[PDB]
Amino acid sequence: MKIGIIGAMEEEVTLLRDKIENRQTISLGGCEIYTGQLNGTEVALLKSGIGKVAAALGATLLLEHCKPDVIINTGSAGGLAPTLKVGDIVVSDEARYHDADVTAFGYEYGQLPGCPAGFKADDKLIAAAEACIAELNLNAVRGLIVSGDAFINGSVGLAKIRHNFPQAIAVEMEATAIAHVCHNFNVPFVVVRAISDVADQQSHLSFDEFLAVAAKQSSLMVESLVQKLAHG
């Protein structure tokens, strides 16, 4: 089994990269992919770019070149549900674009032609992620994550998303693009995002302080999840 890992947090990628044995570096289309073994398990590691196209570009290169059996995609996101707390770990049951709209042609809002309206994470990968997260004393919340190229941090944009996706609990800029690529390659995936801030709530930590803690926690979670998916 080969596990593909795509992470948004720079420090998490560095920490994981330094743990890879027999490490090789592939440079393509402006991206760097690290391959080798993480505690004996074959892995392919990439830092995702910002925005849908950049994430899709990298995910496509990783899938085509390395052909992993599953993908673990990590990062951070803004929380949309009031009950979320900074530091919660949202685990995707599905991912949808909040800025795709061809409803004029009969498609569901957020859905693009040729794709499911929502891209579904793999049941087994979800279960494994939740077990690893809980084992690390973190709080997993399963739910819908929406992605778009417009950064959300205002009342208007926030209102639009809640109107279009009442069940969305987290928002960021790359998850759905990565899920979409995985879907086109028929590769099972799971998306995980540490919540950095919660809508309508003043955050105590600065993004930098959040990242210093979340990136380390996330790298350990990934290392545990890689092991779990390899040897149960």
Q: Which of 66, 80, 100, 170 binds a second copy (CB under 8 A)?
A: 100
Q: How far is the CB of 207 from a second copy (least distance, A)?
A: 11
Q: Which is nearer to a second copy, 19 or 47 (CB)?
A: 47
Residue 188 interacts with a second copy (CB under 8 A)?
no
The answer to whether residue 130 is catalytic is no
The answer to whether 214 touches 9, Cβ cutoff 8 Å, is yes
Within 10 angstroms of residue 204's Cβ, the number of other Cβ atoms is 9
Residue 30 interacts with a second copy (CB under 8 A)?
yes
Residue 40 interacts with a second copy (CB under 8 A)?
no
Q: Which of 38, 57, 191, 199 binds a second copy (CB under 8 A)?
A: 57
Residue 122 interacts with a second copy (CB under 8 A)?
no
SS3 60: helix
Partners of 34 in the beta sheet? 25, 45
The answer to whether 34 touches 151, Cβ cutoff 8 Å, is no
Q: Is 9 among the annotated ligand-binding positions?
A: no
Side chain identity at 108, as an amino acid letter?
A: E
Residue 44 interacts with a second copy (CB under 8 A)?
no
**Between 207-231 and 10-17, two packed helices, what is the crossing angle to 10 degrees?**
40
Q: Is 174 among the annotated ligand-binding positions?
A: yes
Partners of 7 in the beta sheet? 47, 74
Residue 203 interacts with a second copy (CB under 8 A)?
no
Half-sphere exposure of 109 (CA within 13 A, CB side): 10
CA torsion 139-145-151-153 (nearest 10°) is -60
Provide the annotated binding site: 78, 152, 173-174
Catalytic site positions: 12, 197
Provide the annotated binding site for substrate: 78, 152, 173-174
Q: Which residues of the shown chain bind a second copy in the complex (CB under 8 A)?
A: 28-31, 49-54, 56-57, 60-61, 63-65, 97, 99-102, 104-105, 112-115, 148-151, 153, 176-177, 180-181, 184-185
